[PDB]
């Protein structure tokens, strides 16, 4: 029980916007969990829905200030988390890159190093990821919430207009990606 456990009580709520979700994604009834299946569902289409990008947005809109949120990913060795401009091309077929208004951390595999007999894994993958946004500082950074390690920090970003939190479970898995509710 140290300062980092206490300050994590600043984590805010995020609820997913079902109208933005790629048609392979399912959402929980409380809109805090998302899972990727292997089936394209029959959903009403619109410009707001990610296709073919396997993403969903939070309902929340960032225009200023400091924002922290936590996502349980569990055993996953594949996910993407961060933020994007409200006005991105949600039908983008190529890479979702900083140049097109996507600021996302992507976990696509694991590192090992050569050891005495074999290979050693570097670290347990994070089960819980914290995302920190400081709009005026142009700051976006990602942490392993359980041990407080930095995963990634973007270079200073010249944010303008509205940002949305972005979630992307990159594999099918029995493990939903879950937004952690605020404490109390």
Residue numbers in the entry: 276 to 459
Q: Can I see the authors' text?
A:
TRIM family members typically contain a RING domain usually catalyzing ubiquitin transfer; one or two B-box domains mediating protein–protein interactions; and a large coiled-coil domain region, which is involved in self-association or oligomerization with other TRIM E3-ligase proteins. About two-thirds of human TRIM proteins feature a PRYSPRY domain, also known as the B30.2 domain, in their C-terminal region. All characterized family members shared the same overall PRYSPRY twisted β-sandwich fold consisting of a 7-stranded and a 6-stranded antiparallel β-sheet.
The crystal lattice contained two protein molecules in the asymmetric unit. In chain A, β-strands 7 and 8, usually located at the edge of the concave 6-stranded β-sheet, were displaced and interacted with the corresponding region in chain B, forming a hybrid β-sandwich. The equivalent β-strands in chain B, however, did not interact with chain A but were disordered, resulting in an asymmetrical dimer within the asymmetric unit. However, gel filtration analysis showed that the isolated TRIM11 PRYSPRY domain is largely monomeric in solution. Nevertheless, the observed subdomain swap in the crystal indicates an increased structural plasticity of this region of the TRIM11 PRYSPRY domain that was not seen for other family members.
